[PDB]
Design a protein around this ligand. Sequence first.
Ligand SMILES: Nc1ncnc2c1ncn2[C@@H]1O[C@@H]2COP(=O)(O)O[C@H]2[C@H]1O
Ligand SMILES: Nc1ncnc2c1ncn2[C@@H]1O[C@@H]2COP(=O)(O)O[C@H]2[C@H]1O
Ligand SMILES: Nc1ncnc2c1ncn2[C@@H]1O[C@@H]2COP(=O)(O)O[C@H]2[C@H]1O
Ligand SMILES: Nc1ncnc2c1ncn2[C@@H]1O[C@@H]2COP(=O)(O)O[C@H]2[C@H]1O
Lengths: 199, 199, 199, 199
Amino acid sequence: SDSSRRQYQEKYKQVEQYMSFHKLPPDTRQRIHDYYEHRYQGKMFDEESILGELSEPLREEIINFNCRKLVASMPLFANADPNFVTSMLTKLRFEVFQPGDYIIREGTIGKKMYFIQHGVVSVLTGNKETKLADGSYFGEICLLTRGRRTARVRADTYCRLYSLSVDNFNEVLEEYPMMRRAFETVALDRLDRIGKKNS
Amino acid sequence: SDSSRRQYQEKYKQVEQYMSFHKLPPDTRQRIHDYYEHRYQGKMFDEESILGELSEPLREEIINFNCRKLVASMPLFANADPNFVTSMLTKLRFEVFQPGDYIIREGTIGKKMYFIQHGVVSVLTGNKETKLADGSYFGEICLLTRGRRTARVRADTYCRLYSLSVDNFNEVLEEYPMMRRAFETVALDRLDRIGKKNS
Amino acid sequence: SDSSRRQYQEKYKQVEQYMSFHKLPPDTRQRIHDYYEHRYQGKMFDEESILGELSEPLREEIINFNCRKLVASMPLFANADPNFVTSMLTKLRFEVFQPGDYIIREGTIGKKMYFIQHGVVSVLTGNKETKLADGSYFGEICLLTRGRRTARVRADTYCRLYSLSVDNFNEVLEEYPMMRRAFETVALDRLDRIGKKNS
Amino acid sequence: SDSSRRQYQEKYKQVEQYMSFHKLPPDTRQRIHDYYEHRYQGKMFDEESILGELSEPLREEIINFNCRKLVASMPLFANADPNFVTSMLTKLRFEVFQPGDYIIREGTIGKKMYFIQHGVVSVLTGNKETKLADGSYFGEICLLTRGRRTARVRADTYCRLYSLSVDNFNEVLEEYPMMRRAFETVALDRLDRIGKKNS
Ligand SMILES: Nc1ncnc2c1ncn2[C@@H]1O[C@@H]2COP(=O)(O)O[C@H]2[C@H]1O
Ligand SMILES: Nc1ncnc2c1ncn2[C@@H]1O[C@@H]2COP(=O)(O)O[C@H]2[C@H]1O
Ligand SMILES: Nc1ncnc2c1ncn2[C@@H]1O[C@@H]2COP(=O)(O)O[C@H]2[C@H]1O
Ligand SMILES: Nc1ncnc2c1ncn2[C@@H]1O[C@@H]2COP(=O)(O)O[C@H]2[C@H]1O
């Protein structure tokens, strides 16, 4: 049924006047148009408000239902205690990225990581371009090491991701330490496909 | 009179489209329906906004009036200095739970506790299932010990609870230290109905 | 002109249904009615939003204009550098209190102080009841000492006050240290009208 | 197109009643009128909300487009790595100031700095009045030194500025340390046009 469509139309209308007030380039206006399309597919809800009204058991049932493909396609999540998984899902924040974008720049102090729900990113360490898709993640190396982004990451398609901050990362992993090593293992393989490591 | 009914109808309508957009299972949609029913009984107010407009003396008169049964049915509150009580009420946050739910999982790092206003929960330490109802609380052991949930707690009925975080717990108890021992006593009896203690 | 009257009528209407939903006593409902009357005199504005849109130079011109009587009637403010004054005004938060109320309870850990704009409070240390009115303040002793409220303070009339937290208090006084001693002097006179002091 | 004009008209209407309720002087009411004129030029958008809906890559494309003249006219920004620049833009907060105003007072503990986008400020250290315009900044000395404003800064025209807090300043400069010295160099020249320095 249509009604949260109008808040979208109503909001995006506001965006349109915002763009026009700032006399933005056309490529920008287009890009902004298409992003909204991809991020909201036409409706808009107070998801934050809706969620807040609910209880934890429900919110978890929702995020869990919504990330069934995320969870099944990702070994680290799929072969994990669904309680650790839940607690991690519950902290991801959804984000959309368009082709060309820079999700992560090299040299930058990294304070978050990403779970590719859907799309293809390009990783360029520079050495060779390694590629990652649905069921993968990246940017965990700054969360472990608290240093600089050991490469660049660039979206090739309309990515749909989930972000996790170092805060939440370290929280979930203090509660479920066994799982720190999973992320550790992966990070090393990658540091050794570069030529580095931490201590 | 009817008018805050509409914000409820208006909000829940939004929930309905939110659920449908996410193509949620029917058991979930039902569960979500019934929760709202139990948490809002049909109206919705900016209680947070209303409260903020008021002063402390009033807000306290309200929460106090509203928790008359909570306070009378609970020795620890009832035989306590109503000033300590007030200051504790004023920090509880209301929460509803449905049958089956997991209020508390074992092994999890605990950062809050609960005051059963109304309903029956099941405690499973696993050893025997101990039961708790109106006029009881639980989950105080992680607040005292800052370790892991020493059992599991599962709602049997539509519970109506009040939650207290460790922050607020420790604040109220620094102002009124005599009362730390009450919660202490209870926690031990329970640790000794298990087989543990802290230091 | 009338339009922010309606938000008041609209809000208070909500309060009315809130009160009725919670089946509050009549004395309470009356008290709540009269408070609103005294705190909003019938209109309601997004003062926080309005203010945020403004700049610092304006907000200060406003609070300054609005506290002309507060500032003139209070030696400590009136004989002070209007720059220190401004910076203090800018941090007060307006509060209304009704007759009978307990602004401050003895024994309680104190985290804020008050500037009587208008009304009469009663101070009971217990020894004798000392009285304070417009152009006075109180509750500065816990801000200096970080201990317990050295008395009780009870409104006799519909008080209109401004509150200052210890945070802001200590901030404004680190920028303008000369002024710490003013509040210090006053606090001692009062501790010696009791029988105490700090160190 | 007109629609965010109404929120402006609707908001400013509220301001008008706010001013009248507080019986503000006419010079103030005028001043407040003209400020709004200069800060919103007639429309109002949820820029914060709009921005939040967007992604980082877009927000940056916007702020970057909007600060083209800011960036080109300011050596420190223009001859800098546009990545450091971006990350700094992204943290500025827009502010408008009217003639006469005190942007910065001497002796005050300084917790932020300014980038003159457009307008002329007057600096009075007191020694001689030095002047600064578009493509300049000031108030960086307290950010480096964490002491007191080494002068006074007063707007001569309707200034349009961008503010940067010490927090964000020190964050951006920990990520891009080479750039600390730029701001350092400038600060010294200025301390030596006074007669001071830090250690
Ligand atoms: N060889 C690789 N294969 C896959 N992913 C990589 C490789 N090298 C780096 N990454 C990811 O790219 C990210 C770049 O930023 P981070 O250092 O935060 O974390 C890095 C890894 O998560
Ligand atoms: N034998 C028991 N009887 C009643 N309550 C208990 C018992 N054992 C544990 N609990 C409660 O169950 C809670 C489980 O989580 P906590 O460790 O936070 O705190 C525990 C107690 O509050
Ligand atoms: N003799 C007195 N005369 C006036 N005010 C007092 C006197 N004694 C205490 N007070 C005020 O009453 C306040 C009670 O709380 P505080 O200790 O925070 O600070 C105290 C003083 O500000
Ligand atoms: N001689 C000068 N020329 C230009 N700007 C100055 C001069 N002296 C001081 N300033 C600026 O004026 C500011 C006053 O506050 P700050 O100490 O924060 O930082 C100071 C400088 O940024």
